[PDB]
């Protein structure tokens, strides 16, 4: 509706309403119907041209939306996968995973794959005394919700630091990035 032809047709239609009154407007009903049909034909000719434009515009807009969304998905692929991974890990809320994640956040990351056997070699990197104090007590080492027995500790420069030497008093006596080897208990 709201078209210049529409109103025209409407007016003609209105006249056809008057056909009820005045006995078909003094019996001009045949001419009235002819004019009404002609105007309606013009209006119908007008309508389809706009329907076609609407279809074309809708198709174009859908295609633009598709292209934009595909480009966005294929652009943020690396950034959107790590966030998902860490949200899922946070949701799991496991004792072992949280321990290693926190330690790695501080800086105590491993140097190989945590072996799942009774007797296997694990090397970890302690960056500071505080982490050593918290994890390393005596001859035992708490990591990944498990107990490991220390077999050797190597300073940043290859040497063999004895467990006795590692203390608050000797804290500045060593290059602190410290490699610790241990065996699963």
């Amino acid at each position: 509706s709201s078209l210049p032809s529409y109103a025209a047709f409407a007016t003609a239609q209105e006249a056809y309403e008057q056909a009820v009154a005045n006995g078909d407007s003094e019996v001009v009903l045949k001419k009235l119907k002819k004019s009404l049909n002609v105007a309606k034909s013009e209006f119908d000719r007008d309508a389809a041209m706009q329907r076609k434009l609407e279809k074309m515009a809708d198709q174009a807009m859908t295609q633009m939306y598709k292209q934009a969304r595909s480009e966005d998905k294929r652009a943020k692929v690396t950034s959107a996968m790590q966030t998902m991974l860490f949200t899922m890990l946070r949701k799991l809320d496991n004792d072992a995973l949280n321990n290693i994640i926190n330690n790695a956040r501080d800086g105590c990351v491993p140097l190989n794959i945590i072996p799942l056997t009774t007797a296997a070699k694990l090397m970890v990197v302690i960056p500071d005394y505080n982490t050593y104090k918290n994890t390393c007590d005596g001859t035992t080492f708490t990591y990944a919700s498990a107990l490991w027995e220390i077999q050797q500790v190597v300073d940043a420069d290859s040497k063999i630091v004895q467990l006795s030497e590692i203390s608050m008093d000797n804290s500045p006596n060593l290059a602190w990035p410290l490699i610790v080897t241990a065996l699963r208990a």
Binding site: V77, T78, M81, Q82, T83, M84, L85, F86, M88, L89, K91, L92, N94, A96, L97, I100, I101, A104, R105, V109, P110, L111, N112, I113, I114, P115, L116, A144
Partner: protein
């Protein structure tokens, strides 16, 4: 929590593959073995231990991921 680990393993291996771990044959073989064993697992403790191993593989690489920011 079996489905959660079976999906987190998929996401974790995708992240590892995007970080170009395929370039090391040994490490990629180990990662594939760990990923394919969690998916067939029927117990939860085994799946979580293998998840620990795979996540340790991910955490070994230092500069690959800024863990401090991701953990926000």
């Amino acid at each position: 929590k079996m489905s959660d680990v079976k999906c987190t393993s998929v996401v974790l291996l995708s992240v590892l593959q995007q970080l170009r771990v395929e370039s090391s044959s040994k490490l990629w073989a180990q990662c594939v073995q760990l990923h394919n064993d969690i998916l067939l697992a029927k117990d939860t403790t085994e799946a979580f231990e293998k998840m620990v191993s795979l996540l340790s593989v991910l955490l070994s690489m230092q500069g690959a991921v800024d863990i401090n920011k991701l953990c926000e």
